């Protein structure tokens, strides 16, 4: 049993850490809009989109029952981007930077 407001207090600093990465978090701060970005096949490749604003909303409204559901969503966001984008691309390398930041920040929090 984890109180959702206790989850938010424990977990939101790990999310604020990702938002602080500028410009690395900018591709991730809102859901990918495939028409606006001119990438119409995005939803064919990415079946379960995820982004920072969606995770933040789930945190703020108590949608996470347990800390691994949050980690699963953050990892999903990263895996989607690594899947869709080429290894040589700007978004892929920004994703790798965010994942580096996240792994450093989430590791002690999960120990709590
Ligand atoms: C052209 C390919 O773009 C992508 C491809 C793939 C993916 C993923 C997450 O797989 C992400 C993107 N890129 C974006 O989603 C994106 C969006 C906005 C945005 C949206 S609304 C006001 N701005 C700004 C920026 C941005 N990057 N640097 N500065 N701004 C980047």
């Amino acid at each position: 049993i984890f109180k959702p407001e206790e989850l938010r207090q424990a977990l939101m600093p790990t999310l604020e850490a990702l938002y602080r990465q500028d410009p690395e978090s900018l591709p991730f701060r809102q859901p990918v809009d495939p028409q606006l970005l001119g990438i119409p096949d995005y939803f064919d490749i990415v079946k379960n989109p995820m982004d920072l604003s969606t995770i933040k909303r789930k945190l703020d409204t108590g949608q996470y029952q347990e800390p691994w559901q949050y980690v699963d969503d953050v990892w999903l966001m990263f895996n989607n981007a690594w899947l869709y984008n080429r290894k040589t691309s700007r978004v892929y390398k920004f994703c790798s930077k965010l994942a580096e930041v996240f792994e450093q920040e989430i590791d002690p929090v999960m120990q709590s």
Side-chain angles (χ1 to χ4, degrees), residues 22-33 36-39 42 46 50-51 77-78 80-85 89-92 94-95:
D22 189 320
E24 289 79 6
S25 73
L26 294 177
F28 301 91
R29 287 184 184 192
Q30 58 287 301
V32 169
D33 185 334
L36 165 69
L37 298 170
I39 52 171
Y42 180 83
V46 175
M50 188 55 58
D51 70 294
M77 171 179 74
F78 297 147
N80 286 344
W82 282 323
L83 174 66
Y84 177 77
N85 300 280
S89 67
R90 179 179 183 271
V91 171
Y92 188 110
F94 284 5
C95 186

Side-chain angles (χ1 to χ4, degrees), residues 45-57:
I45 294 165
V46 175
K47 305 188 195 312
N48 294 116
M50 188 55 58
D51 70 294
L52 291 172
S53 68
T54 300
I55 298 169
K56 189 206 293 165
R57 176 181 316 107

Side-chain angles (χ1 to χ4, degrees), residues 8-64 66-99 101-102 104-105:
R8 184 192 180 276
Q9 167 114 26
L11 301 178
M12 186 70 68
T14 65
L15 197 60
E16 292 177 354
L18 306 185
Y19 274 93
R20 227 131 50 209
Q21 312 307 305
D22 189 320
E24 289 79 6
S25 73
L26 294 177
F28 301 91
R29 287 184 184 192
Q30 58 287 301
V32 169
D33 185 334
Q35 174 186 14
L36 165 69
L37 298 170
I39 52 171
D41 62 334
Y42 180 83
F43 288 146
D44 294 17
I45 294 165
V46 175
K47 305 188 195 312
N48 294 116
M50 188 55 58
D51 70 294
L52 291 172
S53 68
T54 300
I55 298 169
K56 189 206 293 165
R57 176 181 316 107
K58 290 174 79 170
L59 262 192
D60 279 334
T61 62
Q63 301 196 210
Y64 290 129
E66 48 110 352
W68 279 97
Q69 290 177 319
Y70 167 79
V71 178
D72 282 344
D73 272 351
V74 177
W75 284 356
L76 171 62
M77 171 179 74
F78 297 147
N79 291 145
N80 286 344
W82 282 323
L83 174 66
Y84 177 77
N85 300 280
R86 315 204 80 265
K87 293 185 206 66
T88 56
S89 67
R90 179 179 183 271
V91 171
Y92 188 110
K93 297 185 184 296
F94 284 5
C95 186
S96 293
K97 166 68 168 167
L98 298 187
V101 164
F102 183 69
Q104 301 177 208
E105 297 282 4

